[PDB]
Structure formats: structure tokens, C-alpha cells
Amino acid sequence: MVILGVGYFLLGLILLYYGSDWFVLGSERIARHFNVSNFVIGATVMAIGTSLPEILTSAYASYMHAPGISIGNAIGSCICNIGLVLGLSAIISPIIVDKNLQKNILVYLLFVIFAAVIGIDGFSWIDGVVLLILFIIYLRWTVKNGSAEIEENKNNPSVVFSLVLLIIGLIGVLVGAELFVDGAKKIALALDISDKVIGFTLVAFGTSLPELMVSLAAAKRNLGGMVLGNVIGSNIADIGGALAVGSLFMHLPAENVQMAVLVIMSLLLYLFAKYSKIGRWQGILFLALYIIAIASLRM
Ligand SMILES: [Cl-]
Numbered sequence: 045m046v047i048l049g050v051g052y053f054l055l056g057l058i059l060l061y062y063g064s065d066w067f068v069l070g071s072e073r074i075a076r077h078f079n080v081s082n083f084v085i086g087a088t089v090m091a092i093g094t095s096l097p098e099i100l101t102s103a104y105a106s107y108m109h110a111p112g113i114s115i116g117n118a119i120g121s122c123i124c125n126i127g128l129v130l131g132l133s134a135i136i137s138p139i140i141v142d143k144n145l146q147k148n149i150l151v152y153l154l155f156v157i158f159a160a161v162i163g164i165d166g167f168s169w170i171d172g173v174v175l176l177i178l179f180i181i182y183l184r185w186t187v188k189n190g191s192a193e194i195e196e197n198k199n200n201p202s203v204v205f206s207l208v209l210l211i212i213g214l215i216g217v218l219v220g221a222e223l224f225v226d227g228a229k230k231i232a233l234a235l236d237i238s239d240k241v242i243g244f245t246l247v248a249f250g251t252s253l254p255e256l257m258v259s260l261a262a263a264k265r266n267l268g269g270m271v272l273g274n275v276i277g278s279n280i281a282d283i284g285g286a287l288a289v290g291s292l293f294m295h296l297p298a299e300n301v302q303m304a305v306l307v308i309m310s311l312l313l314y315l316f317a318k319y320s321k322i323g324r325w326q327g328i329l330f331l332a333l334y335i336i337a338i339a340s341l342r343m
């Protein structure tokens with residue numbers, strides 16, 4: 045309608061700007077309550093809350109007999125998370141990785157390499173069932189090594205604020221992203237600038253807006269571990285969660301080009317984390333590869 049396609053667009057961005065910040069502050073206070081590293085709270089609670097858009101999209105698309113979008117959206121998100129999301133964040137707040145997280149990232153690499161190998165055929169529902177189970181135990185393994193056993197425990201009005209601040213921030217970024225996207229074709233439709241590729245590859249970016257905005261918030265507060273966790277977790281939540289659910293309704297066609305790309309960056313992310321840093325010149329490299337990715341890779 046334009047306006048409601050604008051007074052939306054802006055309304056969503058404000059719910060993204062402040063929403064991401066509250067979702068970060070809420071998670072970081074929760075992470076300190078469960079005594080758990082920022083990496084883990086980002087790899088679990090945040091990663092899944094942010095990857096809810098891809099899950100529902102991939103599910104809805106695969107069910108609607110459009111499996112190409114489902115897998116395309118799942119892998120497209122992963123590439124965006126390493127290239128754009130982590131790329132921007134690394135420059136802002138460089139992270140050096142302790143040897144506790146290097147192995148968690150190494151697990152991520154094996155996981156991705158595994159999905160790529162069994163994905164050459166495509167993704168049968170069985171292929172998805174396995175991924176969904178590997179995804180489940182990754183979380184528990186991540187919580188286990190990242191946690192310590194203490195008390196636990198409340199009415200504690202310092203935890204209720206943490207919990208509430210978290211879910212408000214989550215509802216904020218999910219709605220704020222939804223408003224942004226809905227507000228984005230209302231502006232496009234009423235100027236008659238619409239077809240196929242804007243109607244999709246805009247929402248392909250729409251599901252990635254929660255990760256982007258949330259990571260920018262944590263990076264600006266130098267909570268780099270949380271960012272790194274939210275990137276790794278979301279990716280696994282995209283492969284083991286979004287993609288897997290897509291395989292249940294229908295066979296997902298092979299995307300060996302995008303997988304090979306994802307593996308390379310994932311490989312790059314590990315090597316940087318083990319022997320070097322994740323700072324300006326690595327983040328720059330990720331963005332460059334992301335630029336090349338969106339410039340050259342097909343429809
Ligand atoms: Cl940190």
C-alpha cells in the first residue's frame with residue numbers, strides 16, 4: 045500500500061535495532077546465571093531462536109512441493125553467516141579462540157563435511173533424520189563442556205529480568221525482521237517492481253536478518269564469543285534443523301556448488317581459529333568471498 049509498506053519498513057528496523065540489543069543483553073545475563081560461556085548460550089538458545097525463520101520457511105517450502113527453495117534457503121543462510129555476519133563482526137570485535145572452542149568448531153567442520161558428502165545424492169528424509177539427531181547431541185555436547193555443575197536453582201528478580209529481556213528481544217527481532225520483509229514487498233508491489241527473484245531472495249535475506257542484527261549487537265559490546273557461537277550454532281541449526289525438516293516432506297535436490305563453498309569457508313573458519321586470529325583481515329576476507337558468492341553463484 046506504500047506507507048504500511050514504509051511505516052512498516054522503519055517500524056521493523058527499530059524492532060531490529062533495539063530488539064537485537066535486548067536479545068543479546070538477555071542471553072548474556074542468562075549465560076552468567078547457568079554459569080555458561082557466551083559461546084554456548086549463543087550456540088544454543090540464540091542460534092535456535094534466530095534460525096526459527098529458516099526452519100519454518102524450509103518446512104513450508106519443502107511441503108509446498110518446492111524443495112529447491114528449502115535447501116537453497118538453508119545453505120544460503122550458512123554462507124551468509126560466515127561471510128557477511130561473522131565477517132562484519134570480526135572487523136568490529138576481533139576474537140582469538142581458546143582451545144576449548146577450537147574443538148567445538150572442528151566438530152562443526154566435520155558436521156558440514158558430513159552433510160556435504162551425504163548430500164551429493166541430495167537429501168532423503170533419512171538423510172535428514174540423521175542430521176537432526178547429530179544436531180540434537182551437538183547441543184547437549186556443547187552445553188556439557190560449556191557448563192559447570194552448580195546448585196542450580198527461585199523468584200530471583202534478577203533472573204526474571206534476564207528471561208523476559210531475552211524473549212522480548214527475540215520477539216523483537218523475529219517480528220522486526222518479518223515487518224521488514226512484509227514491509228519490503230508492499231513497497232515493491234505498489235510500484236510494480238516485482239517478480240520471482242525479489243519475492244524470494246529478499247526473504248532469503250530476511251531469515252538471516254535476525255543473525256545479522258543480533259551479532260552486530262554482541263560485536264559492538266565486544267561479546268565476540270557469543271557472536272562466534274551464534275554463527276556456528278545457527279549454521280548447524282540450518283543444516284540439522286531447517287534442511288532436515290525439509291527432507292521429511294520431500295527429497296532435497298543436490299546443491300554441490302553451494303555446499304563446496306560452505307565447506308571451504310567452514311574450513312577457513314577452523315584454520316583461522318586454531319593457528320591464527322579472527323580479526324580485521326580475516327573478516328575482510330570473509331566479506332570478499334561473500335561478495336564473490338552473491339556475484340557469481342546461480343539463480
Ligand atoms: Cl565473549
Ligand SMILES: [Sr+2]
Pocket residue numbers: 094095096097098121251252253254255278
Ligand atoms: Sr536465521
Ligand SMILES: [Sr+2]
Pocket residue numbers: 162163164165166167168171
Ligand atoms: Sr543423499
